[PDB]
């Protein structure tokens, strides 16, 4: 009753802390280092620090593993137990069996896995033996914490883009869309494109780079163009041309402006022009530009529109309750919650707005994006904390004529 323990296991971040404080106690990487020692014991190493210090040690026995798959679900449960025990014993400094526990599961189109729920119940009750235990749906908690019963949640994380429409507080499962192109993808592309400029055990090193200079490059150098990048190249080229023609940088062509990034490991300047920065994030919207599995329909825009129309068509399985598909559209598009760390790149929200408006003209677009960066990165955990402090209100069940009718049939 006094406080809950709140834990969110993301594909990148793990956020933990008591429900009675707004700021989390811990934010650690979901990845961890497993170290087979010369002492004879297997040691687990959690935390951006500690993991970085260890990666610095360059011990051969060190291997970095992931705790959460690209689906947002835990795939390594012994390691998850180890992390939870780390958070409980050394950080929160409380016995698991003392307080309740609130965790996060991502929104899924199909009926929830009772396998991983059995895994959660086995972890929480059998091993750590927590007295009470609750699971919340991340984008749903996010919507509830903002008081939006109807919400269109675009969450751009490291795993990909997770799109979750919500109408009247229910998740609308069959309209849930997950993308393959997130912040990890960007990590890889940054490494690839910047590789030539750098060139002229391993896993801990790959990690280390992803958590240091790559991260800084993403948070500083990456930007999203307000519209299609090629069209914008054309536009800025022609506009640049026509304004000097009335007969050392150019103010009418922003795409050729030099931007400088200090690459610390080699202590050398990496110079790119604004176009080349735009390209990285542009891959999220036009994935076809990198390779082919990737249909243009795998881009953020088509996926968003797809989710919207899917939610629209799906809401009629309820018989529509009005006297409506276009109306649910308007409803989703008027409550758009943009969240996720990757969504903090400079031009994301405006580009998402553009992409939604060109595919839904004659609609009113209203988007909400938390301007507090730390908050946008941990929004789901914050929502979970909100739900954790809710009262245990015993709300009257609704009751359908069919709910009474099937019982009336089971009597006979």
């Amino acid at each position: 009753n006094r406080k809950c323990v709140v834990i969110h296991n993301g594909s990148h971040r793990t956020v933990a802390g008591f429900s009675n404080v707004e700021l989390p106690q811990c934010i650690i990487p979901s990845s961890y280092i497993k170290r087979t020692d010369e002492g004879g014991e297997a040691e687990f190493i959690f935390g951006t620090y500690n993991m970085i210090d260890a990666a610095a040690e360059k011990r051969n026995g060190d291997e970095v593993y992931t705790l959460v798959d690209s689906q947002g679900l835990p795939y390594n449960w012994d390691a998850l137990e180890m992390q939870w025990r780390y958070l409980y014993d050394t950080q929160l400094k409380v016995s698991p069996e003392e307080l309740p526990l609130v965790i996060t599961m991502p929104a899924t189109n199909g009926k929830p896995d009772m396998a991983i729920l059995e895994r959660y119940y086995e972890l929480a009750f059998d091993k750590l033996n927590v007295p009470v235990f609750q699971i919340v749906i991340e984008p749903l908690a996010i919507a509830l914490s903002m008081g939006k019963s109807s919400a269109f949640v675009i969450d751009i994380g490291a795993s990909g883009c997770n799109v979750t429409p919500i109408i009247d507080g229910i998740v609308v499962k069959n309209a849930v869309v997950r993308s393959k192109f997130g912040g990890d993808f960007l990590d890889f592309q940054v490494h690839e494109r910047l590789a030539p400029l750098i060139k002229e055990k391993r896993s801990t090193d790959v990690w280390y780079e992803a958590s240091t200079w790559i991260q800084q490059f993403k948070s500083t150098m990456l930007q999203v163009s307000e519209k299609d990048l090629f069209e914008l190249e054309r536009y800025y080229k022609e506009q640049a041309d026509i304004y000097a023609k009335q007969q050392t940088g150019s103010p009418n062509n922003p795409l050729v402006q030099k931007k400088n990034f200090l690459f610390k490991p080699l202590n050398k300047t990496l110079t790119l022009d604004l176009k080349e920065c735009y390209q990285f994030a542009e891959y999220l919207f036009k994935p076809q530009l990198i390779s082919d599995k990737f249909s243009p329909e795998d881009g953020l825009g088509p996926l968003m529109a797809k989710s919207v129309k899917k939610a629209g068509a799906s809401i009629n399985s309820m018989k529509a309750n009005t006297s409506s598909p276009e109306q649910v559209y308007s409803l989703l598009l008027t409550n758009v919650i943009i969240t996720g760390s990757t969504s903090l790149i400079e031009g994301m929200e405006q580009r998402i707005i553009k992409e939604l408006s060109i595919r839904f003209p004659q609609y009113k677009l209203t988007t909400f994006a938390n301007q507090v960066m730390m908050d946008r990165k941990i929004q789901g955990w914050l929502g979970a904390l909100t739900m954790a402090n809710l009262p245990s209100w015993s709300l009257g069940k609704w009751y359908s004529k069919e709910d009474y009718e099937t019982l009336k049939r089971d009597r006979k």
Partner: protein, 428 residues
């Protein structure tokens, strides 16, 4: 009134100030060792008291590295503080300065012991970092590097708030200087080394001070016992090769380059952890602000030339600035346009770190400064952590006395209503 009991418990001492003044306001009146003697009864129940019974009672140090390792010992220590108060100089408000490492459990237990046992009506639990913050008005973003004996705390503060998830500590401090000096002087004993570390001639040299003269920094110092120049039964220290210092046994000892060595490891580690810590601040501008306001405190930091060296290391490691080779290339290439005899006279000049436009980057910090202290500190000791913490605590005190309309502390009423969990309704 103001009769406020301010208690600031640390690993090795505890500062206590009884009552507030606001005219002829005072430094901590009482400084007592953080320790309590403990005996065991017939059934294993513990009896805590101030002084050892003859030779037989177990000395307990409740606080290690700022953490409370024994909560019961600590609470009893508080009780003995109130005893030790009323015995010299009856319901007084308690303002307890807390450490970041103290758990919610610890804090709740402290609250319950303060109310149900000590029976005082008003409790305030004030984070040290926030007290230190409030001491310096209108300082919103900063980073406290606090170097203790066995550990160093790194406490970033953004928008007047302690960032709990970024706050960390490293198991290095003043003692590590002793360790590395011991590695450099394996023949000396620990007391002579300690005396060297506390001697006037013990100082960290600037790269200016190193390059000018003497020795050559990159080994073992000497494989020879401490040189005793004298015993009983004026020019820059940097410039002399050998220098003198006095022992606690009354020995005049000569010493070489070792008086300039011992802090490199500590400051390097510190600089690393600081680097990662501030690197993980989410908002770029807040991080920039934090980098512009660095607070270096702790006893160890009073060593001559230490703060300047830590700042220097922070710049060396973390400052975002054009590589000297690139900048020189651009300078030479730019100077190519000058007539060969102007180029000629420009070659052996002291460079103006000029001519052509500096390269601007998309990262921070491009500026790393120690936070400048305000005018009203004088004076002892070195305007340290204790001083600013007590100043801030005093500011808070005044702030809550002059605002009767608001209750921003734990009251006996509210404790009776919500229990120890009443603590969390009043947070800084």
């Amino acid at each position: 009134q103001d009769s406020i009991l301010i208690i600031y418990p640390r690993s090795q001492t505890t500062l206590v100030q009884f009552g507030l003044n606001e005219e002829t306001f005072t430094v901590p009146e009482l400084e007592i060792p953080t320790q309590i003697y403990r005996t065991t009864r017939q059934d294993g129940s513990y009896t805590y008291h101030s002084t050892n019974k003859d030779n037989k009672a177990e000395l307990i140090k409740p606080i290690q590295n700022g953490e409370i390792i024994d909560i019961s010992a600590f609470t009893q220590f508080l009780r003995l503080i109130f005893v030790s108060i009323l015995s010299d100089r009856s319901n007084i408000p308690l303002l307890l300065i807390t450490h970041h490492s103290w758990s919610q459990s610890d804090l709740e237990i402290i609250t319950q012991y303060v109310f149900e046992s000590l029976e005082i009506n008003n409790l305030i639990q004030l984070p040290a970092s926030l007290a230190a913050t409030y001491s310096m008005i209108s300082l919103q973003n900063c980073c406290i590097i606090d170097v203790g004996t066995h550990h160093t705390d790194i406490i970033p503060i953004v928008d007047y708030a302690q960032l709990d998830h970024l706050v960390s500590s490293i198991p290095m401090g003043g003692q590590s200087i002793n360790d590395s000096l011991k590695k450099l002087l394996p023949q000396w004993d620990d007391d002579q080394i300690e005396s060297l570390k506390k001697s006037p001639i013990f100082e960290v040299l600037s790269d200016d001070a190193k390059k000018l003269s003497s020795f050559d920094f990159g080994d073992e110092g000497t494989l020879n016992v401490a040189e005793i120049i004298t015993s009983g039964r004026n020019v820059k220290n940097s410039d002399l090769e050998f220098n003198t210092f006095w022992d606690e046994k009354g020995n005049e000892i000569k010493v070489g380059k070792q008086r300039f060595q011992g802090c490199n490891n500590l400051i390097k580690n510190i600089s690393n952890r600081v680097g990662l810590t501030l690197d993980n601040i989410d908002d770029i501008n807040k991080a920039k602000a934090v980098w512009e306001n660095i607070i270096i405190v702790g006893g160890t930091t009073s060593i001559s030339g230490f703060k300047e060296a830590l700042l220097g290391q922070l710049l060396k490691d973390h400052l975002i600035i054009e590589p000297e080779e690139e900048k020189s290339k651009r300078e030479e290439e730019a100077k190519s346009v000058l007539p060969a005899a102007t180029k000629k006279k420009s070659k052996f000049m002291t460079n103006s770190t000029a001519f052509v436009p500096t390269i601007e980057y998309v990262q921070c910090p491009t500026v790393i400064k120690l936070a400048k202290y305000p005018d009203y500190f004088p004076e002892w000791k070195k305007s340290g952590y204790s001083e600013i913490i007590f100043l801030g605590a005093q500011i808070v005190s005044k702030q809550i006395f002059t605002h009767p309309k608001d209750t921003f502390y734990i009251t006996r009423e509210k404790y009776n209503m919500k229990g120890p969990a009443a603590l969390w309704d009043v947070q800084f």
